[PDB]
Amino acid sequence: DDFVMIGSPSEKTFKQRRTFEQRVEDVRLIREQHPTKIPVIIERYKGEKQLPVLDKTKFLVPDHVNMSELIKIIRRRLQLNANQAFFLLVNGHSMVSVSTPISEVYESEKDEDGFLYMVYASQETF
C-alpha cells in the first residue's frame, strides 16, 4: 500500500521509430544541405536511472568539433550538475579520451545508415 511501479511500454529507440530507408534518406538529404554538419543520433541508455531524457534526438555537429567539446555541450543541453556522472559511448567507447574531430570519428565510426550513433548514461559499463 505504498508505491506501484508502472512499467514503461518499451522505451523506443530511433531505429525502432524510423525505417532503414527513411534514415539513409534523412542522412543523405541532410548532408546534402549541411556538408559541414555531421548527422548524429544521441540517446539515453535503456537502463538509465539518473539522467533525464534529452529533449531532442537528432543533431548536427560541425565537423571541426572534437568529442570532448561534445560532452560539455550535452551536459549543458541536459542542464547537468558539474558533479553528476555523464558518459557518452560510441560503438562501445567512452568518448572522454578522444582528440579527433567528429568528421574523423564519423567516417570511421558511422552506422550503415549514415548517422553517427551515441548513447549517454551515468555509468560506462553494462
The alpha carbon torsion through 113, 116, 119, 125 (nearest 10 deg) reads 90
Taking the C-alpha atoms of residue 64 and residue 75, their distance in angstroms, rounded to an integer, is: 19
| Domain interval for residue 12 | 1-126
The CA distances from residue 123 to 1, 2, 14, 38, 89, in Å, are 32, 29, 21, 25, 10
Please state, in angstroms and rounded to a whole number, the distance separating the CA atoms of residues 112 and 126.
Answer: 24
State the method.
X-ray
Whether 77 and 48 have beta carbons less than 8 Å apart is answered as no
> How many CA atoms within 13 Å lie on the side-chain side of 68?
5
Number of structural domains found in the chain: 1
Resolution (A): 2.6
Sign of CA dihedral 31, 34, 36, 42: negative
Query: What CATH number is associated with residue 123?
Result: 3.10.20.90
Question: Dihedral (C-alpha) 28, 32, 34, 39: value to the nearest 10 degrees?
Answer: 10
Contact 38, 115 (CB under 8 A): no
For the chain, state the CA radius of gyration: 16
Rounded CA separation 6/56 (Å): 24
